[PDB]
């Protein structure tokens, strides 16, 4: 699965700036970019984070 | 453990910061400075000055390329009298919010096991200031106000010993 | 708010929420109109209290406010519960997963 400029907390949140994707029924890995910076449109404290991007 | 640009600046002058806050009344006899009652150098405890408490609201913006570290304190009083002494205010919250946490802090008013004398309890904490962040502070009782911050950057542990220099 | 849902696949359901955090009392007001509001996730293995604070913070991408995002899983043949008088971000889409891997940072093409 590739989400191109958007991150996981683009994806998993759905960022409008992220629409154009197509998630398929199956993966291995979740690729970000170094410019992931279109994700949390809306600041915050996104607790326990860190388990959820190794749970997908 | 591993600084190496350290410098020990104020970041609040201790001349016009709190005007309508007493930084002298809030000592203790824990903590003496030379026999007489005291409290901490790099922390002010701020206590109620008259009848009532102003509401606390200071900031300081990241003027320098590294990061500023900065420790406050939480105070919790033993008894419901001692906290209507010293604040004159029941329901007190403190807020600390930088550009990436924001934190809520509640002090509880119980009776603790008296360790050196003192029934109550005070938990520090800290946080880290990016360059170009800035830090805010929102409370109105229970806070310990810092006094000096410490600018670091770094890239270490902790030694116990007796060994000289 | 009050709702439901009953775990009628064979594999775990993942389940995002959210609190949101106002800026200023006024904003929690014009929001919601509850000053005391409390946010509740309860399953068979965790039950959660939720309760968001209205305080000032500096001001990130045009925004006073935060919003604290929240997860849990769900077990096949547990019914998750939602109540809340508040703040709460309802969810929309569920991610129904089985597993048995990380996350990379990079420009390569696919």
Request: glycine letters at 8%.
């Amino acid at each position: 699965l590739h989400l191109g400029k958007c991150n996981i907390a683009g994806w998993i949140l759905g960022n409008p700036e992220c629409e154009s994707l197509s998630t398929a029924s199956s993966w291995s890995y979740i690729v970000e970019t170094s410019s992931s910076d279109n994700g949390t449109c809306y600041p915050g404290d996104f607790i326990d984070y860190e388990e959820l991007r190794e749970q997908l | 453990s591993s600084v190496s640009s350290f410098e020990r600046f104020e970041i609040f002058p201790k001349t016009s910061s709190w005007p309508n806050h007493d930084s002298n009344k809030g000592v203790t006899a824990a903590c003496p400075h030379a026999g007489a009652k005291g409290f901490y150098k790099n922390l002010i405890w701020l206590v109620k000055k008259g009848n009532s408490y102003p509401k606390l609201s200071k900031s300081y913006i990241n003027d320098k390329g590294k990061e500023v570290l900065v420790l406050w304190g939480i105070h919790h009083p033993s008894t419901t009298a001692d906290q209507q002494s010293l604040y004159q205010n029941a329901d007190t919250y403190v807020f600390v919010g930088t550009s990436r946490y924001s934190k809520k802090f509640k002090p509880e008013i119980a009776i603790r096991p008296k360790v050196r004398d003192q029934e109550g309890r005070m938990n520090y904490y800290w946080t880290l200031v990016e360059p170009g962040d800035k830090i805010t502070f929102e409370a109105t009782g229970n806070l310990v106000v810092p006094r000096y911050a410490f600018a670091m950057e770094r890239n270490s542990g902790i030694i116990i010993s007796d060994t000289p220099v």
